[PDB]
């Protein structure tokens, strides 16, 4: 269809890991963003068929959403905190690529990103 | 428009409304209907200023903008006492307690 399969959340050929920083990213960072009033557009992959966005997956080469990130954390997909943080950044960046600078969805993403940056600023040192 | 009033004397408060265009005397008629003393036994005041019977409430400086239902304007009332009028005397309401610390 217009819609590609979503990013993989589990890959047997990719080393799995857990650290106290990845736990914090699931239990504090992802949880806080997931519960935000404006999380809903970001909770699952962009459905370009339903939203009638025939160019979305032509413009966005590395799709990412918080549903994918949640499942990646819960399945220990990430090697370290940086890998997980990269996925959150990709999600924000994709929104900013596809949408106009004053768009409603961009203001929602900026609100989540501000909160995201505040929470990862308190990331525990690895221990 | 309408002006929302509190007419106060001693420990009496009347909540009423009237028009900017209505007169001080008309307000005394309202007081008469309620406290059963005629206009000639009443002096009305805005702060310490005696109001003339013939003036409209608007001419006295009452306005719809400053006499709201939720924040009515005060009219002082003094009653005749035989050969004199009593001094305007509006008894204060009680006081709340100190604000609790948990309310900042």
């Amino acid at each position: 269809s217009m819609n590609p399969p979503p990013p993989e959340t589990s890959n047997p050929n990719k080393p799995k890991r857990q650290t106290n920083q990845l736990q914090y990213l699931l239990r504090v960072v992802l949880k806080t963003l997931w519960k935000h009033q404006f999380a809903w557009p970001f909770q699952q992959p962009v459905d370009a068929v339903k939203l009638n966005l025939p160019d979305y997956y032509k413009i966005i080469k590395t799709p990412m959403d918080m549903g994918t990130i949640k499942k990646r954390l819960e399945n220990n997909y990430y090697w370290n905190a940086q890998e997980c943080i990269q996925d959150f950044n990709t999600m924000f960046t994709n929104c900013y690529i596809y949408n106009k600078p004053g768009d409603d969805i961009v203001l929602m993403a900026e609100a989540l990103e501000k909160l995201f940056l505040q929470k990862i600023n308190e990331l525990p040192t690895e221990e | 428009m309408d002006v929302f009033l509190m007419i106060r004397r001693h420990k009496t408060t009347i909540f009423t409304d009237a028009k900017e265009s209505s007169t001080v005397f008309e307000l005394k008629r309202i007081v008469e209907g309620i406290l059963k003393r005629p206009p000639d036994e009443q002096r009305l005041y805005k702060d310490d200023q005696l109001l003339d019977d013939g003036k409209t409430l608007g001419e006295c400086g009452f306005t719809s903008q400053t006499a709201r239902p939720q924040a009515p304007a005060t009219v002082g009332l003094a009653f005749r006492a035989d050969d004199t009028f009593e001094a305007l005397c509006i008894e204060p309401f009680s006081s709340p307690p100190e604000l609790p610390d948990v309310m900042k």
Partner: protein, 91 residues
């Protein structure tokens, strides 16, 4: 224009339109069964009862308005006593 007298614990008397005082379910109950135009409140002081009367005026003016309405303002210092009064008065 029927008025009723509401009397505070500390002895202030408040004279309000009957229709306005009927905003309170408690006052409505207290005046029910004519077959009484004065109500005593042994536990509501004057600073609170005054503010309650302003609420009655506000409610009747703005209920069923088709357009915008202002906020009913409450100073922090009176909020707990006004909450107790409102709970007692069912308004």
């Amino acid at each position: 224009m029927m008025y009723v007298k509401l009397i505070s614990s500390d002895g202030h008397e408040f004279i309000v339109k009957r229709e306005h005082a009927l905003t309170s379910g408690t006052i409505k109950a207290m005046l029910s069964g004519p077959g009484t135009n004065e109500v005593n409140f042994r536990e509501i002081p004057s600073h609170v009862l005054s503010k309650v009367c302003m609420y009655f005026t506000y409610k009747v003016r703005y209920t069923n308005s088709s357009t915008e309405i202002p906020e009913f303002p409450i100073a922090p210092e009176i909020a707990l006593e006004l909450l107790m009064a409102a709970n007692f008065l069912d308004c």
